[PDB]
């Protein structure tokens, strides 16, 4: 089948039309970043994704592993997955506590944090039935661009870089560790990675900024985020920028074993 089959026409569209980046590429792209959150390839079966991992953020939801919030994240974009689908299935006022009421889920927002009272299989039990929801897939599309691609693209962009490789890496880091923010999100990695034109020495330099944070601050465990890590890096080292027939390069650079 075409991988342009795994998005709505919608996000097919908006997609090329904001990123550059055709239905292989993005396809590309999830595969990667799928890898490191859930050991497999099958992106498409994870909306209805929702866990507590432990870390200290509260519930993990999702494609982009959207977080509820906790003392590791005071700042999460879970309330915005959250408000995205209240307002996808036609709130006149869309919110994340609006989002809860409709999803008969006892919580709300507590400062920057959704605070939710029902016990995890409770709430996770609601967000797995969302799996084949229209309005929640589309918000959690709107969601992972507003806030975590539209400033990936934008900082690839404005260093004269286009390729999936770069976007995707910069989108997975952005997911992983905040897009911005403090000195582990994508603005402070890009702050320590200086300002070489050259993308392949660019990716090399930045890899490396990342690869000495991304185990740390619970963010991965360890060897988990160096191996992410790897996997961009080993495409710019091939030299697969485009992720277009790149299928068994994908499956040489996830082939490590999740700890
Ligand atoms: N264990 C993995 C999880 O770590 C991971 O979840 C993501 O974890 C990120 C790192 O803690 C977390 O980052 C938050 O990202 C948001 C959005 O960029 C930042 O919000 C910004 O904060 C600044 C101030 O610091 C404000 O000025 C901005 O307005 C605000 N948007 C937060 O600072 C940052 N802590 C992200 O929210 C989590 N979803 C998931 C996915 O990889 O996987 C787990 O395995
Ligand atoms: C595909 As494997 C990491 O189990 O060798
Ligand atoms: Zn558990
Ligand atoms: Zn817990
Ligand atoms: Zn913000
Ligand atoms: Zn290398
Ligand atoms: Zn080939
Ligand atoms: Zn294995």
Redesign the pocket.
Known sequence: ASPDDNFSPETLQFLRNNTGLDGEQWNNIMKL?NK??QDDLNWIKYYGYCED?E?E?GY?IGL????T?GS???????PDLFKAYDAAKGASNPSADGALKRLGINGKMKGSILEIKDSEKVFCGKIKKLQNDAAWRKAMWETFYN??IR?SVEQARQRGFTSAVTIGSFV?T?????????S???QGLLARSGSSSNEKTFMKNFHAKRTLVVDT?????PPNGKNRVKQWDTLVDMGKMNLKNVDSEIAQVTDWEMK
């Open positions: 970043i490191p959150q991992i870390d953020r993990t982009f592993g959207a977080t919030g590791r994240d005071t700042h999460p974009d879970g806030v975590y400033y997975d952005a997911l992983n560790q905040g897009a911005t923010g403090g582990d999100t994508l601050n619970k963010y991965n465990k």
